[PDB]
């Protein structure tokens, strides 16, 4: 294929144009109380600019998401279900709210059910806990972080859940969660189709890491970066205030390190940036720290939680070793070994994970959540199922779950972002004597200029 | 015929593929002390249905991708870079200054970087005296602050005077950070310096908060502007809600667009009326929407773009404010006690550092602008389209401008939350209290149950 | 009488110890389901530290506010009323919430009524709009600015309002507003006592200007400063970006200029600071601006809304001062050729916002104590903060005097410290400046030379 | 001892009026280049009721007010000022550095200002080499940032070495920005420099975020710390609420006090349990409060001061040697919930150490102004020959406290005071019942809602 990595429980070994076909629940009878279009996967041309229009490098076309002239489900007779799974994430309530109010205010659906604490709230034993989502209940939930429905990790019995959906007359079930959640949602889809029950299962991709394939952005990412940067600023001030001071700060990234990268660059306070895409040895790290301490009394280390997972697997995804705490103790033991050279020295660990997830979204992420939701509803009412909504090239597209779980995104280590990271982070490939000379040369040239202009300012 | 408007002094009456060719200063001798031009389609939509072979763009237009080049035209250790910030301020102006400075110094190792004070006036013979050296030490933490250390000013100077100053200071590359007018001036400087046969690259960094730049989905400062706008709406709302028949008027940015007005209205979800230039309506149309709102609520919030109602360049905020006040003082009968609050948050929106996302965006826009100017790009701007960075000829970028698609999903989402006269108020208000009552009865039932 | 100013319709010409006696509704029968103490007005000693303990300069003693062993009203039989009057203010909802929940959760009162849009919500035609304040209704109101009850300026008929209080069985009415509100609340108090009706009227002082007498702090002030400072930072960046750029920024202060002062000092970006306490001429201002433009291309002017109220034909001193400066710079185009003047009214972003956590805690405490005291039969009085202690002040007193910047005080020192001084010869000052600048840069030069091998 | 606690190595067993006398360096020759000491009572509470004569303080103690003096002791244009920041960082450290610098330069026009790097180590022979010049240009915008440009370090140095460096650099005034350890060191330097008869003024700027300083209602950084704590609680709460039987443990500052824990708990109003050193309780007492909370809610938030429960797991450099009560309490709760899986089946426990986001940040504008004032006054008084003393804030006034006194006593939550009331008001009380008492509460909202229902039915018509 091209840019993407094969996921660990991939259902596809490649993606053909057929794989991108979005399952449509049979029928399209009722008019929207309010033809499918495509966009190219790759907008790069195959040839150089000749006489005729340009041609995509990739044969892949993606289905654009938008409110349909004809809808499949009958508005005033439909019941919408929502369930939030996994760890929390900025704007979870924003998705809940926009789904609720699009169903109520735009399609005028019969009712909206919010299932409590993830898939457990569709189990026979926790279907008792579900709640009614009227306007009054979601009025200001978007002003807050986490989820009013609550969440939980891991799966339930597909049969139990489809049982609860039928019993509550749920025509559309919106699965707000990560890879594992949407793979579960495909199981529910194939169970409800095994029974021939008219239910649409539709995924709203919840990943803060923004490692979603056929996606440039997922909701919560931008807010996560903003927060990460504020955590780095505190790590930096804590580290700078100490002689041979190290600040370790763990940012999100199991599979990607997009947060680690973008936050490192944006703060411009990152001296070392450890991401899963670029795995390096313990001694490689300590060597970068050693280099840094040649010329500065201060080092700041960004580490993605998915880095150095050799210094497993829960329910869907993978059990991480706490690389933050490991890396912290490794550095401490390295500095206690070279007390000779780095006499007084201090190492500070920061897990800002809680302040990053558990907060309302930036207005830009809030608007993005609102749009992702409203469109997901517009399409589920038009019989879309077994699919997610994502953002590519300024457009909203529908991706089959089977595809979206098969491939994942990952830093291009030859790309402009990672350039800008190496631009600011320690490079062993710089002679520190020669570099530091040419530095003070410029500093001196500049200060002598000011000296000259100040002499001039005497009457 | 697509989603662009032809600009007021457009230099092109159409755009052909030739018009998109980016001027390259002759020669490409020196190697990038760091380390074929590539394209992306204008329109990524296919002409046909998904058939056997790969899909084909609806539009014949191809855009030049911006990236660090294997071969550069200018000699690093012999080059001098010039920067000038023009017009009104904007979030992350200092971020662009800093990243240009430090990319030139730290990545290309240029001889020196000159910052011209207060816009084009700082290249005039009479203000070239005020220009400053941009060493690392001078730009260290400027990105943490709003406005511009160089300072800015509106309007033009003598092209000859400015090229004179560029030659005298040995400026090989001049980075013009400003709006439409600035970049049109920058093309004048380009054509003057080429009339003299002087090896200077003039390169534009588009400064518009309104995000109305053609061949662009995003301009630096926009996201931060939205974030701030939303915080101003939240204060307008709390001020209006606290009053019986309370109106909050809040003026957001938008001379030509109303992208801020729209996105902020939707994101806050506190906008009852949203006035933008793209949708001009009468005074009575406004007062009718306010009247409708006051049928069911004691509270109205009005978003107005500074470029709206320019037939009532005129302070529509203060006009609209007095119009509403005079309308409510007429109709005291119906709206007895009533209060109207004007808010100009313009100052808190422009004059502030960027959000981390806009900071990263500024940094990238800059670093790439340098990577391309060193590779002999001139008479062009850098913009963001479809997740990619592209080089657009100034002649093109000034010929068309962006504008809200009133049939597009964003404006849908605005009408979704703002007063609609086209809704029967009796029928709507009924179906409202029906749901309210259903919900109340549910809670009632569960509370009755709570006898353990 | 010394450091305070006499208010414009003061009910007292001085304050005696008797004037400070806080009206107690007769009876104290029921136990708190949960002796009055004093603090000195002035804690300064009359004499030196001699053999015996020190003695206050002032004879005045203030009643400390705290939960009483015995309360006057019967908890499960009491109804509490709240009304927010005037302009909004950070933490209005915080006061509403803490009063509500102290009455409910601590005293377990029968019910709590919130009267809509200020005194209008106690008028016969408006009492229909009042609302029930259960826990569920005030749960998260403190996260927001302005008032869920809503507010309105001006008075109503005292008789109409006492009529509504009796009809709704309101035993305690909490008046959240400024001077005018509490003077109205005393009228209601004296009307309800003219009828012999067992109602306690208790004031929670709402002033952002913090010009309340017998008070060092009022709720909303700290938050106001924080916001003011953020407005100055934008004014500054707007002004700096222009050649001969002026930023005018109007902060709160009708009678005081405490916000103007504290914000000027805290930002340290204020070049001129105009406050009502120090009224100066138009030409005095333009002279300070002129001085500033001798050495800098940038001036930032803090103006209190109550300054220069004699410049007009409150008058909008922000807009006046703005046009005056513009006309002065257009007159001296010769000297200040290109020049720009930017006005900023951040008034809306300052009032209409939730409180800083420190102001939220302060609101919570002001409220909870106001309830603890009203249940113990306190009436015709306000609660304020003096010298780290909470005290009860008779409204008659609190409306008679107001606070005001001490222009010889350390704060105003720190303002003059950073704002243009005409009393500096600019030639001699600017010399001694570049001397230090050069000394400093030569030092760095020396240390950089050292860093080479 | 009456309201205050005796500190662990207190230099006084009581405070008399003589103990409050602020050491004045002999002489007061030069005029303040800027154009008789006043007192305030310790306790402003009267002994008797309001009778015929003026009221009399309960306490005989009078405190010296701090303010710019008509006559100063040191010669401005001939004086050198020294600054050193010690210990852990704190909001507005740079604000104190800046205001001291610029008051000395701009107001007194002192000869020079030296900033000693990384605490007392920067006065040691071996680190005196690292000290820096503090000109206007160097402190211009440092106040916009957290931590210290000078840098800091814990622990002591040789008093002789440090006085050696002070004499060699001609430092007339040394400003010690640190905690009570730092100021006790500063008294050692004071008594060493007086043993040599060297005209040096040692003046303390109290750096405690915990706000446990005696003869002080406020220390710089406190308000900002609260603000930040509250934002950490809000994230702890949202993380806990999103889980079925979800616990959020959040460690706030408080080695000796728990003022942050208390004020943050009350202000957030999201705290279900609040553990502070002043009120030590058993492991089972905690788990019992959690158990109670889980009877009625699926969500618990626990505020723990770092100085609480220091007997669940002596004394190295400073006061003690703290066990990580955050991590202990976290594992204890986890093991308790894993034991009662029966009752609390699915359950989640989240630990949060927001310590770094609280210290390492610039001050709130209110704390910035407070830092600026503390500094400018400290300079105004050191120039007027004040030494062996700190500046603090009491009853809206700035006072000078002898270090010997300030290190002898410390503040601590009054557990019968209105603040701690307001904490118990919102935190789990075992003295509400299972059902028979714990019942009367679930009323109100239902009674209210039928009224609104009725009026909404009416709005047909
Ligand atoms: Cl919501 C979601 C998130 C990520 C992915 C692909 N992926 C990324 C990392 N591991 C799998 C797929 C989906 Cl459906
Ligand atoms: Cl910097 C810039 C800003 C806006 C536009 C398009 N335009 C023209 C007039 N209004 C918007 C073009 C450019 Cl090049």
Q: Which of D398, D399, D88, D352 is CA-nearest to residue D238?
A: D352
CB C357 within 8 A of CB C376: no
Residue C101 and residue C205 in one domain? yes
Breaks (C-N over 2.5 A) in chain A follow: 34, 311
Alpha-carbon distance of D346 to D338, in angstroms, equals: 9
Number of H helices, E strands in chain C: 13, 17
Single residue among B387, B405, B423 that ends a domain in this structure: B405
Question: Is A405 near ligand 1, meaning CB less than 6 Å away?
Answer: yes
Alpha-carbon distance of A135 to C429, in angstroms, equals: 66
Full DSSP string of C347-412:
HHHHHSSPPPHHHHHHHHHHHHHHHHHHTTTB-SEEEEEETTEEEEEEHHHHTTEE----TTSHHH
According to DSSP, residue A23 is labeled: P
Output the CA–CA distances (angstroms, integers) from residue B210 to B8, B42, B110, in the order listed: 17, 21, 33
Q: Which of chain A's residues have a Cβ under 8 Å away from the Cβ of D350?
A: 354
Helix axes B356-373, A416-424, angle to 10 degrees: 100
For D153, which of A230, A237, A243 is closest by C-beta distance?
Answer: A243
Q: Which of D84, D81, D3, D69 is CA-nearest to residue D37?
A: D69
CB C83 within 8 A of CB C173: yes
Alpha-carbon distance of A93 to A96, in angstroms, equals: 5
Which residues constitute the domain of residue A183?
74-220+361-405
- C250: β partners: C303
Ligand 2 pocket: which of B212, B258, B382 to mutate (most atoms <8 Å of CB)? Answer: B212
Residue C347 and residue C438 in one domain? yes
Residue C298 and residue C266 in one domain? yes
Full DSSP string of A105-153:
III--SEEEEESSGGGGTSTTTGGG-EE--HHHHSSGGGSSS-SS----
Cα nearest neighbour of B431 on chain D: D460
For chain D, how far is it from start to end, CA to CA, in angstroms?
72
Question: Is B210 near ligand 2, meaning CB less than 6 Å away?
Answer: no
Select from C138, C294, C429, C434 the residue whose CB has the most chain A CBs within 10 Å, as the one to mutate to test that interface: C434
Instruction: Residue A323: give its domain's CATH number.
Output: 3.40.50.460
Between chain A and chain B, how many beta carbons pairs sit less than 8 Å apart? Answer: 181
Buried b (16+ CB within 10 A) or exposed e, D156-190: bbebebbbbbbeebebbbbbbbbbbbbbbbbbbbb
- A302: β partners: A249, A273
Residue B317 and residue B436 in one domain? yes
Alpha-carbon distance of C214 to C397, in angstroms, equals: 9
Quote the ligand 2 centre to B77 CA distance (angstroms).
Answer: 34
Residue nearest atom 13 in ligand 2 by C-alpha distance: B180
Is A180 labelled as part of a ligand binding site? yes
Full DSSP string of C101-147:
HIIIIII--SEEEEESSGGGGTSTTTGGG-EE--HHHHSSGGGSSS-
- Residue B400 CA: which ligand 2 atom is closest? 6
HSE, side-chain direction, 13 A CA sphere, residue B117: 15
Resolution in A: 3.4
For B355, which of A38, A226, A374 is closest by C-beta distance?
Answer: A226
What count of other Cβ atoms lies within 10 Å of the Cβ of residue D346?
Answer: 17
Question: Which residues are CB-neighbours of C430 under 8 A, at least 6 positions away?
Answer: C295
Q: Which of B334, B427, B348 is CA-nearest to residue B146?
A: B348
Ligand 1 pocket: which of A6, A7, A83, A275 to mutate (most atoms <8 Å of CB)? Answer: A7
Q: Which of D200, D139, D141 is CA-nearest to residue D166?
A: D200
According to DSSP, residue C7 is labeled: P
Residue nearest atom 6 in ligand 1 by C-alpha distance: A408
Backbone φ, ψ for residue C383 (5° rounding): -105, 130
Question: Which residues are CB-neighbours of A104 under 8 A, at least 6 positions away?
Answer: A112, A134, A135, B435
Single residue among B389, B405, B421 that ends a domain in this structure: B405
What domain count does chain D have? 3
Alpha-carbon distance of B106 to A423, in angstroms, equals: 8
As a dihedral over the C-alpha atoms of residue B347, residue B349, residue B350, residue B352, rounded to 10 degrees, the angle is 100
Output the CA–CA distances (angstroms, integers) from residue B26 to B164, B171, B197, B199, B376, in the order listed: 21, 17, 11, 9, 7
Alpha-carbon distance of B41 to B62, in angstroms, equals: 5
CB D202 within 8 A of CB D389: no
Which of B23, B95, B210, B212 is catalytic? The answer is B210
Residue D422 and residue D356 in one domain? yes
Residue C226 and residue C345 in one domain? yes
CA distance A121 to chain C (A): 25
Residue C189 and residue C239 in one domain? no
- Residue A178 CA: which ligand 1 atom is closest? 1
HSE, side-chain direction, 13 A CA sphere, residue D317: 11
Residue A195 and residue A163 in one domain? yes
Q: Which of A114, A109, A194 is CA-nearest to residue A148?
A: A114
Select from B95, B235, B242 the residue whose CB has the most chain C CBs within 10 Å, as the one to mutate to test that interface: B242
Alpha-carbon distance of D375 to D108, in angstroms, equals: 13
Tokens of A439: 């530095």
Q: What share of chain D is helix, strand, coil (3-state, %, to 5)?
A: 35, 20, 45
Q: Are strands D246-252 and D348-352 parallel, antiparallel or unpaired?
A: parallel
Question: Is B396 near ligand 2, meaning CB less than 6 Å away?
Answer: no
Do residue C349 and residue B153 have CB atoms under 8 angstroms apart? Answer: no
What count of other Cβ atoms lies within 10 Å of the Cβ of residue B39?
Answer: 20
Q: Which of chain A's residues have a Cβ under 8 Å away from the Cβ of B269?
A: 142, 370
Alpha-carbon distance of A363 to B252, in angstroms, equals: 15
Q: Which of chain B's residues have a Cβ under 8 Å away from the Cβ of D450?
A: 444
Alpha-carbon distance of B383 to B216, in angstroms, equals: 6
Residue nearest atom 11 in ligand 2 by C-alpha distance: B401
**Is C209 a residue of the active site?**
yes
- D71: β partners: D31
Tokens of C413: 């020192």
CB D87 within 8 A of CB D181: yes
Burial environment of residue D460 by CB neighbours within 10 A (0 to 12, 13 to 18, 19 or more): exposed
HSE, side-chain direction, 13 A CA sphere, residue D169: 30
Which of A23, A94, A209, A255 is catalytic? The answer is A209
Q: Are strands A79-84 and B173-178 parallel, antiparallel or unpaired?
A: unpaired
Q: Which of chain D's residues have a Cβ under 8 Å away from the Cβ of A359?
A: 234-235, 238
Residue B243 and residue B349 in one domain? yes
Burial environment of residue A47 by CB neighbours within 10 A (0 to 12, 13 to 18, 19 or more): exposed
Q: Which residue has the tokens 């489900």?
A: A73
Residue B56 and residue B10 in one domain? yes
Alpha-carbon distance of A107 to B172, in angstroms, equals: 60
Question: Is B321 near ligand 2, meaning CB less than 6 Å away?
Answer: no
Quote the ligand 2 centre to B61 CA distance (angstroms).
Answer: 20
> Partners for D (CB, 8 Å, 3+ pairs)?
A, B, C
Helix (H) or strand (E) holding B48: none
Do residue B351 and residue C237 have CB atoms under 8 angstroms apart? Answer: yes
Question: Which residues are CB-neighbours of C54 under 8 A, at least 6 positions away?
Answer: C45, C46, C47, D39, D41, D56, D57, D60, D62
Quote the ligand 1 centre to A318 CA distance (angstroms).
Answer: 13
Ligand 2 pocket: which of B7, B84, B215, B253 to mutate (most atoms <8 Å of CB)? Answer: B7
Alpha-carbon distance of B253 to C180, in angstroms, equals: 39
CB C246 within 8 A of CB C394: no
As a dihedral over the C-alpha atoms of residue B177, residue B182, residue B187, residue B190, rounded to 10 degrees, the angle is -60
Residue D239 and residue D101 in one domain? no
Alpha-carbon distance of D84 to D178, in angstroms, equals: 8
Q: Which of chain A's residues have a Cβ under 8 Å away from the Cβ of C448?
A: 440, 443-444, 447
Do residue C369 and residue D418 have CB atoms under 8 angstroms apart? Answer: yes
Residue B345 and residue B414 in one domain? yes
């Amino acid at each position: 294929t091209s840019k993407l990595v094969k996921a660990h429980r991939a259902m596809l070994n490649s993606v053909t144009q057929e794989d991108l076909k979005v399952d449509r629940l049979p029928g399209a009878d009722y008019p929207n109380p309010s033809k499918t279009d495509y966009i190219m996967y790759n907008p790069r041309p195959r040839d150089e600019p000749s006489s005729e229009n340009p041609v995509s490098v990739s044969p892949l076309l993606c289905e654009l998401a938008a409110a349909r002239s004809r809808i499949h489900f009958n508005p005033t007779e439909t019941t919408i279900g929502i369930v939030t799974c996994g760890g929390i994430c900025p704007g979870l309530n924003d998705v809940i709210r926009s789904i609720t109010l699009t169903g109520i205010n735009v399609y005028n659906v019969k009712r909206v059910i919010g299932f409590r604490f993830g898939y457990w709230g569709l189990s026979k034993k926790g279907s008792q806990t579900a709640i009614e989502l009227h306007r009054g209940r979601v009025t200001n939930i978007h002003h807050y972080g986490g989820t009013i429905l609550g969440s939980s990790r891991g799966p339930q019995d597909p049969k139990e859940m489809v049982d609860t959906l039928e019993r509550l007359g749920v025509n559309i079930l919106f699965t707000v969660g990560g890879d594992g959640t949407q793979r579960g949602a495909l199981v529910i889809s194939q169970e409800a189709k095994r029974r021939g029950v008219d239910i649409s299962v539709f995924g709203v991709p919840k990943t803060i890491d923004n490692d979603l394939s056929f996606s440039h952005r997922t909701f919560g990412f931008q807010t996560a970066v903003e927060k990460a940067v504020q955590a780095i600023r505190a790590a930096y001030a804590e580290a700078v205030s100490a002689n041979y001071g190290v600040g370790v700060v763990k940012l999100m990234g199991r599979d990607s390190g997009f947060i680690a990268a973008q936050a490192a660059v944006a703060s411009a306070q990152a001296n070392i940036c450890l991401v899963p895409e670029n795995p390096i040895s313990e001694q490689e790290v300590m060597s970068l720290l050693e280099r840094r301490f040649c010329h500065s009394r201060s080092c700041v280390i960004i580490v993605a939680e998915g880095f150095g997972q050799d210094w497993y697997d829960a329910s869907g995804n993978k059990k991480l070793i706490d690389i933050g705490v490991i890396l912290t103790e490794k550095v401490k033991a390295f500095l206690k070994a070279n007390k000779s050279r780095y006499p007084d020295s201090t190492v500070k660990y920061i897990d800002p994970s809680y302040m990053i997830r558990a907060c309302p979204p930036s207005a830009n992420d809030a608007l993005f959540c609102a749009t992702l939701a409203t469109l997901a509803v517009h399409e589920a009412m038009a019989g879309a199922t077994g699919c997610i909504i994502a953002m590519r090239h300024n457009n909203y597209i529908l991706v089959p779950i089977k595809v979206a779980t098969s491939v994942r995104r990952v830093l291009d280590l030859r790309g402009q972002l990672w350039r800008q990271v190496r631009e600011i982070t320690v490079d062993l490939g710089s002679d520190v004597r020669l570099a530091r000379k040419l530095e003070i040369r410029r500093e001196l040239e500049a200060i002598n200029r000011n000296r000259d202009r100040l002499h001039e300012e005497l009457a």
